[PDB]
Amino acid sequence: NNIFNKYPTIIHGEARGENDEFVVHTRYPRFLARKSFDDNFTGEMPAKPVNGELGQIGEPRRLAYDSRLGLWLSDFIMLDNNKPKNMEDWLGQLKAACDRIAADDLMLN
Amino acid sequence: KNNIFNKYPTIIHGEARGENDEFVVHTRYPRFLARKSFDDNFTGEMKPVNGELGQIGEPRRLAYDSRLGLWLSDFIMLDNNKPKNMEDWLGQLKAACDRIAADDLM
Amino acid sequence: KNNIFNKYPTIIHGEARGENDEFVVHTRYPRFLARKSFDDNFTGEMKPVNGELGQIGEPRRLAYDSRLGLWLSDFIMLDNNKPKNMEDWLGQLKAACDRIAADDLM
Amino acid sequence: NNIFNKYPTIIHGEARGENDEFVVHTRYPRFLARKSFDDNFTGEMPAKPVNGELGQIGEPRRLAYDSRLGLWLSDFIMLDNNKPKNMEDWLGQLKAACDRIAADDLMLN
């Protein structure tokens, strides 16, 4: 409810005995995601704002965000109850949140 | 969402830019998001953790006191299961807090 | 069941053969079944009711103290709505108890 | 859960400014019902054990128990979550509970 807005928008996460990291987005659309990094990740801010892409990968096909910078978000768990009135609209907002989270992780110093 | 949480580690310790407090997600029952807070004189070394749930202060909110310097508050429940029996429900919420408290002393 | 409760009066005061304590059903949010208990020196005449929720005694259970002689305990929640925000949830549970307390002084 | 079994099996209810009464059954099958009385109700124990009947009445058709003694139970709200494996089996157990509640109301003195 209002209660999520007591929290910061982006929470960056970590668990013991785990190499992947974690993120919580507390504004709409709200979610818990797994944050991972591949070989093309270096951690530095790119010249142009983060412009990732979000799509289905793996078998079975599950939604994934690729920052195109080596940072991935995956295993999304939606924390709101709502059915999006428009899927493309909802996908667009999820991606914007994801770009913001990716950019936030790089500024995390 | 009932079981998707099980792909996640039980306890996720979190942080946020510009914030002093910390954050936890508990991904087993009962699942929740909470704020991690700390006393000034919080040592961190180690009887097993026996905290307690309570409504503290005059802000009228539910907090958890580890009694070892760590607090959990602003509890957001994430499960979809209705708990009729409150008996399990606060006890298990306090039991999970005692685990988050131990796991964070590290 | 989400709304069928609305065909019922908000507060149902109950009794049972062979039992000293009494019983209440609250049929609006938050909906619950509870046990009504009484101090020995409970007068019953009448500031509006401002009780408090608490975990009392060493039995580790959630009770409500009207502070006017009436208690509610053994809370069984009956709603099907998940309350993420605990902030409303205990406050409203305590607000409903303050109403059951006033309504039973009669 | 176990928590219902802290309560007595049958709770007889009343509300302010209401003429109908109310009942909670705390054993399986668990429910909240409205308890009403018609003109053939006198309140005394009949010679043979209560043998009511349970059926659909009104428009729309909603489940009702008639004690055949003037006591009715209606507006059932089921308090358990389960789907009965067998409807006739479940109906049978609901009626037995209802006979027991009816008989309990008469002994309530």
Residue numbers in the entry:
A (entry chain A), D (entry chain A): 5 to 113
B (entry chain B), C (entry chain B): 4 to 49, 52 to 111
The study reports:
In this work, we investigate the mechanism of activity of anti-CRISPR protein AcrIIC2Nme. This 123-residue protein was previously shown to inhibit the activity of Neisseria meningitidis CRISPR-Cas9 in vivo and in vitro. We show that AcrIIC2Nme functions by inhibiting loading of the guide RNA molecule, thereby preventing formation of the active CRISPR-Cas9 surveillance complex. We found that it blocks Cas9 binding to sgRNA, thereby inhibiting biogenesis of the surveillance complex. This interference is mediated through an interaction with the arginine-rich bridge helix, which connects the REC lobe to the NUC lobe.
To better understand the precise mechanism by which AcrIIC2Nme inhibits Cas9 activity, we determined its crystal structure to a resolution of 2.5 Å using single-wavelength anomalous diffraction (SAD). Consistent with these previous observations, AcrIIC2Nme shares no sequence or structural similarity with previously characterized anti-CRISPR proteins. We also created a mutant lacking the final 12 amino acids (Δ112–123), which were not resolved in one of the apo crystal structures. The crystal structure of AcrIIC2Nme revealed a highly negatively charged surface that binds to the positively charged bridge helix. Mutation of this electronegative surface decreases the affinity of AcrIIC2Nme for Cas9, resulting in loss of anti-CRISPR activity. To determine if the interactions between AcrIIC2Nme and the bridge helix of Nme1Cas9 are required and sufficient for anti-CRISPR inhibitory activity, we mutated 19 residues distributed widely across the surface of AcrIIC2Nme. Mutation of three of the four amino acids that make direct contacts with the bridge helix (E17A, E24A, D108A) displayed a complete lack of anti-CRISPR activity in vivo while the other mutants showed changes in activity of less than 10-fold. Circular dichroism spectroscopy of the three mutants with abrogated in vivo activity revealed spectra similar to the wild type protein, showing that the lack of activity was not due to a folding defect. In addition, cooperative thermal denaturation curves and melting temperatures similar to the wild type protein indicated that these mutants maintained stable, folded structures. We conclude that the negatively charged surface of AcrIIC2Nme and the positively charged Nme1Cas9 bridge helix comprise a critical interaction interface that is required for anti-CRISPR activity.
